Amino acid sequence: WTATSGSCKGRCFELQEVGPPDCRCDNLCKSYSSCCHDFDELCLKTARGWECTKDRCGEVRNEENACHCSEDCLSRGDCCTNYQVVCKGESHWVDDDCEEIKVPECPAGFVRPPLIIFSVDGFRASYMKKGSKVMPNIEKLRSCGTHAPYMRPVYPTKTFPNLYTLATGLYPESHGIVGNSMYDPVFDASFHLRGREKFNHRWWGGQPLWITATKQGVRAGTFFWSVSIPHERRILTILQWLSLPDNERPSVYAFYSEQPDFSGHKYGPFGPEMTNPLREIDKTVGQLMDGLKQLRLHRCVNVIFVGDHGMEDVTCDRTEFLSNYLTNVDDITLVPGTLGRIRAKSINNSKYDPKTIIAALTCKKPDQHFKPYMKQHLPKRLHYANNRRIEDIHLLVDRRWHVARKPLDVYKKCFFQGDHGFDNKVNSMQTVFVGYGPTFKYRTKVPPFENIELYNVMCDLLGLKPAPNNGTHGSLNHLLRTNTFRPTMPDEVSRPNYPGIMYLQSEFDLGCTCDDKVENKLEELNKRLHTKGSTKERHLLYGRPAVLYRTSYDILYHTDFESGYSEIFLMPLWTSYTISKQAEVSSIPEHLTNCVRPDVRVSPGFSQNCLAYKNDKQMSYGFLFPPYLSSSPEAKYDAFLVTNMVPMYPAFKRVWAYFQRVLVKKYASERNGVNVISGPIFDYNYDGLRDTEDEIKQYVEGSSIPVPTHYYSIITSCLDFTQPADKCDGPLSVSSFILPHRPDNDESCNSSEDESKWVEELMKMHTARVRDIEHLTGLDFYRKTSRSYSEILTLKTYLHTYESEIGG
């Protein structure tokens, strides 16, 4: 209940929210059904439209109009945004050639440039080019400001998770909003778009931009709006707020449009009906920019034009039904659409087995338009597992399709032609970023980037200190004219040992054999230089990674590779090696197939042993540096050391073998040599961060040898391919993957065929930022290049998507 007896007289869109049961007058009062009786009357005038006409000029102030053209309106700060235009012979902003804004040009009283966030729902990246002829204002912004060809949302590519990520720089797994619809099992409640649950503050984690602002002395406009409030009043309210006196005027503002998403669902991404929604948006933009020119703020304010996601062609008849795969279709709840999420209908059930549910859903029709995963097995770049609100069973749906439970749900719950929510790397989901203002750069294109990064930047524009988030602060410095944040490499925590020869063959009882006995001052002095690291600057191109936690490890040099070997985990943390274009693939000689040699630099006590592997019929082994790419038959023995060996399921070895034997050489040819760093990853609790010694859930049977949950490689080369990797002057180029270490190849439906038909496809799906691997390993790469640190942060955030050219 609320006594709505109070009044909004002079409180129209007040900024401090008063508490029940007195009536509110802010842009959220509607959604809580708690407005004062006169709110509609006083605060939402509509009379005479939103534009001045000639006859309206100089007029007599009438408080009933929606906006004014009366002489005193500039003073009152409430003119129609075109007042200067029709009444004062002034041109529109869109018509002025754009002048570089070399310094802020702000009126007396503005202690800092304000920031306006203009967010547009469902604004697909390719709109900027395709709809350009009917969006001149937005095309002005793009072309004079700083733009990216596209910006990448988070997964799921849905509205709530994506808007809240903009405001926090957090993955949904961390912020709490993992879907538009969610079930929390500790709350036993459901978050849906309709209804009032989504209002309880308990769903919303992280610290959003406006709280960050308040907590540090910067006042904020309120971000959310109410659906019935038209866009014109939304603009005029933002300009009114900007006319407030210095001590009350917010410094950060938000605008939001339901379009073009609302139509995209109706007409599809490119339906001819779409031109109007776009025309509208552009007009709204024009109205902000004209309004800011009226207030002398158009060369003072920084504007961010940003979308939350894109839009794909989707229709009813492209629905896949679980009822055609399952029998007990009724002992499951499904969260449907462009992503599936499954749980037991009741926890009263002990007969409920996910293993059989997954199997029932795996590669079961040749045509299949989805794929089941357990959430811990989803690609790590999706960062979609570490939250109780994410159900164990996830369905990745194909672009252009839906998953539903039964058919009844689709005709009784065709009307739509567009949707969104697919994998964040799918082209049609990409969205927009343009930045315009004094602090942004002038006529500047920047590379595509992930939206989790904007929070840091928006804090920079405000002089705020960003709350702990998932961006990599400094990775977007190249967007800005001048930045308050000069980033610095983290400090090495653990320094390495450099062990020489300290053990004799006979001290090792490891159960390994090797045919290596057949045995010169000139070529003995030589390989000594290899074990001290005389070819280290060939295989360690960017300096050694740093270890950012306390642990005991040894560096190990060889002719063809070099490693950081963990006495704790009994295997290397990283292994680094350069393969030049000219290098050639040889095969493992018949005699050395089962060769495993002790490493006389490392004690028997801190070594793996062949015995345990023999005893464990589930587990086999692999090597980090591949023997196939040894530079000489002699150097090859180096690859068989007990300290280059890692545990690997037979099924994984297939994957690994073909990566090592075929793809490395291929990349080396296409890229002009590559530098490869490879290693294990342990993330048993799937939080995207390295596990500690005492969080290991799986050892090789009868040993203290941990089993990785994943395998990574980082493949680097010269961005200019005419330069070999090992002699690169300028910028670098990189691609990486985090491969799940799994005992079967159920993920690949063509897996019984030749590796050449399915392995590279899997690797692609599990593409990765170097930054993701840093979280998962606790290492820090690229410590010694010729490149600026900011450039190196940009590079560690890059993700190679394997999607073709945006637009067509």
Ligand SMILES: *[C@@H]1O[C@H](CO)[C@@H](O[C@@H]2O[C@H](CO)[C@@H](O[C@@H]3O[C@H](CO[C@H]4O[C@H](CO)[C@@H](O)[C@H](O[C@H]5O[C@H](CO)[C@@H](O)[C@H](O)[C@@H]5O[C@H]5O[C@H](CO)[C@@H](O)[C@H](O)[C@@H]5O)[C@@H]4O)[C@@H](O)[C@H](O)[C@@H]3O)[C@H](O)[C@H]2NC(C)=O)[C@H](O)[C@H]1NC(C)=O
């Ligand atoms: C992306 O970036 C984030 C932020 O930097 C990283 O997540 C941080 O990781 C660390 C280590 O795991 C956590 O530290 C622990 O924190 C607790 C106390 O923390 C409390 O207070 C903080 C800060 O005020 C608060 O954010 C936490 O709130 C969580 O839990 C709420 C429910 O109880 C929930 O409403 C909220 O959304 C948030 O939930 C998520 O995080 C928790 C982690 O605690 C997780 O269990 C849950 O599933 C959600 O994902 C919390 O009450 C200390 O006592 C511990 O000792 C420990 O140091 C930070 O809490 C955590 N911060 C956030 C915001 O999640 C991610 O690791 C990073 N991802 C990657 C891949 O790098």
Ligand SMILES: O=C(c1ccc2[nH]nnc2c1)N1C[C@H]2C[C@H](S(=O)(=O)CCc3cc(Cl)cc(Cl)c3)C[C@H]2C1
């Ligand atoms: O109906 C939809 C909607 C939109 C599309 C869809 N597709 N499929 N289903 C969809 C449903 N909606 C109404 C809601 C209110 C807005 S809001 O005004 O609260 C966001 C303002 C804001 C801006 C920033 Cl920058 C950050 C944050 Cl956190 C919030 C969010 C919601 C969308």
Ligand SMILES: [Ca+2]
């Ligand atoms: Ca972990």
Ligand SMILES: [Zn+2]
């Ligand atoms: Zn949206």
Ligand SMILES: [Zn+2]
């Ligand atoms: Zn939508």
